[PDB]
């Protein structure tokens, strides 16, 4: 059985979304929907997801831009992992 979250996408553009827009970027499974990516992030990190934006990358994988709520800080979630 396949897992939803593969690993975090950590690049410079991923950090600009983390420091400024409270968004965490993940490389997810391509069969996973926006709603499934939302649930899995909440169930793994104990955060509240507001919006998920996906893209099927030229690497064969799916990249997900996950926005957290104002109660949660993206920088603090990325530092523990």
């Amino acid at each position: 059985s396949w897992d939803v979250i593969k690993h975090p996408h950590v690049t410079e553009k991923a950090m600009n979304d983390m420091d400024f827009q409270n968004k965490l970027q993940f490389a997810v499974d391509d069969r996973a929907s926006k709603g499934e990516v939302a649930d899995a992030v909440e169930e793994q990190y104990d955060v509240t997801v507001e919006q998920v934006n996906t893209q099927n990358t030229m690497d064969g994988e799916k990249k997900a831009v996950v926005r957290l709520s104002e109660d949660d800080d993206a920088q603090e979630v990325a530092s523990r992992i």
């Binding site: 391509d30 099927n56 990358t57 030229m58 690497d59 064969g60």
Partner: protein
């Protein structure tokens, strides 16, 4: 042209195959990518 999800995965693989034989394989075998494809000079499928 408009690409499908599968066409995108295939083009993605072709790009990954286009990389060089790593520096360490040259040392391990004690001394060449034959599948070197160029976007202009060569032709892909579909």
């Amino acid at each position: 042209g408009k690409k499908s999800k599968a066409t995108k995965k295939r083009l993605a693989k072709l790009d990954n195959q286009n990389s060089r034989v790593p520096a360490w394989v040259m040392l391990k075998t004690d001394r060449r990518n034959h599948k070197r494809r160029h976007w202009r000079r060569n032709d892909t499928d579909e």
